[PDB]
Design a binder for these strands. Structure first.
Ligand SMILES: [Zn+2]
Lengths: 948, 99
DNA sequence: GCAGAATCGCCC
């Protein structure tokens, strides 16, 4: 049985009404996309704040009545975002900078994108959708919508039935909801003005939802994309070609020696993404524990409203590095530009020869249509040069990254406010106060007119100017950067997926943690009793060493009796990370809706590239256009993709049949309810669609052991063996010797680094005034001998910061020595984890708000007592403990493709972990850069949104 | 290069080139020259970044900066040497062989 | 300037 078959009959969506006298408006604003002057905004769907506790995210929507005595049911999940459209001026904005709607409107037009075009009717009046006896001025109105029927909401084809109102408790607010049904539930028809429409809601969907899906397909006709998505949902068109006539191509495609094949492959990949992504997003999903807002642990110590709002701002600051990385990285998913072919005089193998490209410079160029006629004429860049200069990234490139939406752009600006500025080392720049009182206060600013100089988007851009990427026009095969929630089972200890199933490597690690608990050390490395002096410090290490070395003897004597060939299994092991395909697992931010959807569309396109290339190689285009080739060939290519893309090493998905058990169900009489009467009727029902494609995971892999066989790479991996002078200060004890320095040498002036570097070179150690010389000479000899034994044996390039990491490094060095793997360093993955810090406001002008600034003296005085929250990332030696906390991740991926072994001719895929591009991403990445260390950004969710 | 990369490359040059003295005062005088007043609020995460391969020194740097901030001199490398090299005005050392 | 890999589940 399955979640589709178990879901209950219901409407296509709901209008919620929240009472203004009690609803917590400041809390929802911190999760929203409000800009100054908005008429509509988006917020997350959350139990206890935007929907009632126990809201069902999966339903069988009643969407058609062929005759009055039969209903048809479609299985669907809810859309993740709620659209707030009535009295929306009552929710505060997330960002205070003015003028965003005109800036978005001007920028959309120079890139040749379609603006929202309104229906010829007026919006529905409040008295035609409010419950009877509610005052329309006392309530906030918002829509929750099913993923299968959201285009019908946009196009004004739903019907609201106020007689079917229900009272619901939303946190502490007495709320009401009204159901929405598709106009196809009324076979005699309803008057055209009786349908539900709101011009502000539809415009917000156009900008904040559909424009980003169009940008991910390289389509400009956003309105025509919405019409073809509607027709795909209602008329079962998944196997009919539909996007190809909307495609456009740059001159590097049109002039390529293989131009005809390249236009067919790029077109077919975009068709397959449009057929399969909506079907996976509509599927029935599991309900995560993080969806219940009234149980989030981050509120535990809060008293009253101000304390809760402050906790939500600290939560948002810990997500900001994920969002800033998608702006500052040159290879961000937001900057993907098209598809290209390795031009024969290139390195790629046949299945890798077609690949995804990135480039903002390419995204400005003129284009040609599928018949090779001129199409978009291109854009020359800024008509007046902004503060970053000619040919560099401008504020228009940030507006393009935000899909020309004032709602999304406002929330991107709010996250960018947490970031540190990083000036270039050779460029003179004004001080913050003389910029804000000077150029930012000019009446020539098109955003603020000089009347909001401390919060203006031009001031935020000026402060962050040197962190933005270059503007690129090249065609190289690079990894691209994805963001989202992680899955349940990640293998990120030092040997990855080694012996994951059969005792196992997971059991070996649990046995080690149990031995360390009996010595008084917990799983994060905290002691129950800290050392009193030199003897205890030595005894602590000798007992941990004896615990590790006993467990190695049992594990090796197991491999012997069970006959396990572990020497071979070490050579083939990988780190494994799971990227979740559940849209409800994502963090409670509307920007994460766009990053998840565009990550999924990009991965589907990249998986399809060799599948499309092989079909066209056997069925050649012969100078047909992509639309005329797809008319004969697309139904076969859909069936090939379903077999070849799924369970072949990157994407996992399950097909399911959906059944309804009763032939009838208890529903309100819809012909009576339209005329104002409520009573039950048993309606005969059947399914309109029987098959569902439930997505599971995307798998990211990284190889651990280097075998020597690629002789070109060895110098990046080779283990030296000669005695160095840095052997104590870069050995295993130095961080512990520093933590305990004042217990060990009570009354010295020396630093720990200098004391131990002096022992290294001069073999002398100070003896504390009341202590004894024997005890200190024993401490010195313990540090020396242990540090040389580590120098000669170690293949893990880490200095351990806690006793658990020290013990795990010792354990894994002993396994690799039994295998003979002692000539090279292994590959490492390190987690970059966010840290929140409060700092003096002088270099963070946004704390002043929409206030005027008259001089640099008044700016200094006004900022002198204030502070700002900022975020920085710290490197962790131990990605395994972070993965147990169910993190939000950002990482670079390339999908590589290869033939099977032993004469298996089939195409298999791996999603390999890659590198970040662009110097502004994070200071920890600054110096390929390393073959043997890779990085992932991670924020934990256990103890924040999910209870331990 | 960013300005913070140049401060980091300049501190690793000081630390890797001393012998027979502790390095803490020269590192502090270098930061006070590069940043002045902004040292008064330097965080541990920023101090650990700027010290590079010697980030273990960060606890000793932040304490020395707190003694400057709590004693009232202006933030220049001259006034900082007059205070630090003046406020001191001792360790007995044993030789340990090698087997 | 950035290895190689026939794949699915299993999961404590
Ligand atoms: Zn301005």
């Amino acid at each position: 049985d399955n979640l589709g078959s178990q879901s209950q009959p219901g409407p296509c969506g709901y209008i919620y009404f929240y009472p203004l006298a009690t609803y917590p408006l400041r809390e929802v604003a911190t999760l929203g996309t409000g800009y100054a002057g908005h008429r509509c905004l988006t917020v997350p769907l959350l139990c206890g704040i935007t929907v009632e506790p126990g809201f069902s995210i999966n339903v069988k929507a009643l969407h058609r009545r062929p005759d009055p005595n039969c209903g048809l049911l479609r299985a669907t999940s809810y859309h993740r975002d709620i659209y707030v459209f009535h009295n929306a001026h009552m929710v505060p904005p997330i960002f205070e900078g003015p003028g965003l709607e005109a800036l978005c409107g001007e920028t959309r037009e120079v890139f040749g994108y379609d603006a929202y075009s309104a229906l010829p009717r007026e919006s529905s009046k409040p008295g035609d959708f409010f419950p009877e006896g509610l005052d329309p001025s006392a309530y906030l109105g918002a829509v929750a919508i099913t993923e299968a029927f959201k285009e019908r909401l946009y196009s004004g084809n739903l019907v609201a039935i106020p007689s079917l109102k229900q009272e619901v408790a939303v946190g502490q607010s007495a709320s009401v909801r009204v159901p929405l049904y598709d106009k196809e539930v009324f076979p005699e028809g309803v008057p055209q003005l009786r349908q539900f429409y709101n011009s502000d809601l539809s415009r917000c969907m156009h900008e904040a939802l559909y424009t980003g899906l169009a940008q991910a397909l390289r389509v400009r006709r956003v309105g025509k994309l919405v019409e073809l998505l509607e027709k795909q949902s209602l008329q079962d068109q998944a196997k009919v070609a539909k996007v190809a006539p909307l495609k456009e191509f740059p001159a590097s495609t049109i002039s390529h020696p293989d131009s005809g094949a390249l236009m067919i492959v790029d077109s077919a990949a975009c068709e397959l993404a449009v057929s399969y992504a909506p079907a996976m997003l509509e599927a029935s999903h599991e309900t995560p524990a993080s969806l219940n807002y009234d149980s989030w642990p981050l509120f535990a110590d809060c008293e009253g409203p101000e304390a809760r709002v402050a906790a939500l701002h600290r939560y948002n600051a810990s997500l900001a590095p994920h969002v800033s990385t998608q702006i500052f990285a040159t290879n961000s998913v937001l900057y993907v530009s098209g598809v290209s072919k390795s031009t024969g005089q290139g390195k790629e193998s046949l299945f890798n020869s077609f690949y995804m490209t990135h480039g903002l410079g390419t995204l400005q160029e003129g284009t040609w249509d599928p018949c090779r006629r001129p199409c978009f004429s291109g854009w020359g860049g800024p008509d007046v040069t902004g503060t970053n200069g000619p040919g560099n990234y401008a504020v228009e490139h940030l507006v393009y990254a935000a899909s020309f939406s004032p709602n999304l752009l406002a929330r991107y600006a709010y996250y960018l406010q947490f970031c540190q500025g990083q000036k270039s080392s050779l460029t003179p720049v004004p001080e913050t106060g003389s910029y804000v009182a000077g150029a930012a206060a000019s009446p020539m600013c098109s955003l603020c007119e000089g009347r909001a100089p401390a919060v203006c988007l031009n001031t935020l851009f000026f402060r962050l100017r040197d962190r933005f990427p270059p503007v690129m026009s090249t065609q190289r095969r690079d990894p691209y950067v994805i963001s989202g929630a992680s899955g349940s089972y990640n293998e990120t200890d030092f040997l990855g997926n080694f012996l994951n199933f059969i005792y196992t490597y997971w059991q070996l690690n649990q046995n080690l943690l149990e031995r360390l608990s009996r010595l008084g050390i917990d799983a994060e490395g905290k002691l129950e009793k800290e050392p009193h002096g030199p003897r205890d410090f030595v005894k602590m290490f000798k007992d941990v060493d004896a615990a590790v070395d006993a467990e190695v003897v049992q594990f090796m004597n197991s491999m012997a009796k069970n006959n396990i060939t572990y020497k071979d299994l070490v050579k083939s092991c990988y780190h494994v990370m799971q990227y979740s395909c559940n849209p409800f697992a994502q963090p409670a931010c509307p920007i994460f809706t766009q990053l998840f959807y565009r990550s999924l569309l990009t991965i589907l396109q990249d998986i399809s590239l060799p599948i499309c290339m092989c079909y066209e190689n056997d069925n050649p285009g012969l100078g047909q256009s992509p639309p005329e080739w797809l008319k004969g060939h697309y139904q076969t290519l859909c069936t090939n993709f379903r077999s070849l893309a799924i369970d072949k090493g990157v994407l996992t998905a399950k097909e399911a049949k959906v059944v309804h058990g009763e032939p009838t169900c208890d529903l309100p009489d819809l012909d009576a309810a339209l005329q104002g009467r409520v009573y039950g009727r048993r309606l005969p029902v059947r399914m309109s669609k029987v098959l569902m494609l439930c997505p599971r995971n995307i798998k990211i892999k990284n190889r651990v052991v280097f075998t020597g066989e690629n002789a070109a790479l060895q110098n990046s991996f080779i283990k030296s063996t000669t005695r160095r002078e840095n052997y104590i200060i870069n050995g295993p004890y130095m961080k512990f010797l520093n933590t305990y320095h004042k217990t060990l040498f009570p009354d010295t002036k020396l630093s720990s680094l200098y004391l131990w570097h002096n022992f290294s070179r001069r073999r002398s150690v100070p003896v504390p005034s009341g202590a004894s010389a024997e005890e200190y000479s024993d401490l010195a000899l313990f540090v020396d001998g242990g540090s040389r034994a580590h120098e000669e044996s170690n293949v893990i390039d880490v200095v351990p910061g806690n006793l658990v990491t020290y013990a795990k490094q010792r354990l894994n060095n002993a396994i690799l020595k039994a295998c003979g793997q002692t000539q090279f360093y292994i590959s490492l993955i390190q987690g970059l984890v966010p840290r929140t810090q409060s700092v003096p406001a002088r270099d963070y002008p946004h704390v002043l708000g929409t206030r005027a600034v008259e001089s640099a003296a008044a700016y200094a005085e006004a900022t002198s007592s204030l502070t700002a929250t900022t975020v920085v990332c710290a490197a962790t030696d131990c990605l395994s403990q972070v993965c147990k906390a169910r993190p939000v991740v950002t990482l670079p991926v390339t999908i590589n493709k290869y033939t099977g072994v032993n004469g298996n001719n089939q195409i298999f895929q791996a999603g390999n972990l890659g590198y970040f591009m662009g110097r502004g991403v994070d200071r920890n990445l600054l110096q390929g850069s390393s073959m043997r260390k890779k990085f992932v950004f991670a924020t934990p969710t256990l103890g924040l949104t999910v209870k331990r | 290069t960013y300005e913070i990369e140049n401060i980091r490359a300049g501190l690793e040059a000081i630390i890797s080139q001393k012998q027979e003295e502790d390095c803490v005062f020269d590192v502090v005088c270098n930061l006070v020259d590069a940043m002045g007043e902004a040292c008064a609020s330097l965080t541990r995460d920023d101090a650990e970044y700027l010290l590079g391969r010697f980030s273990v020194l960060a606890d000793s740097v932040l304490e020395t900066l707190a003694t400057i901030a709590s004693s009232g001199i202006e933030w220049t490398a001259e006034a900082a040497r007059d205070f630090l090299e003046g406020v001191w005005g001792q360790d007995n050392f044993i030789s340990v062989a090698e087997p």
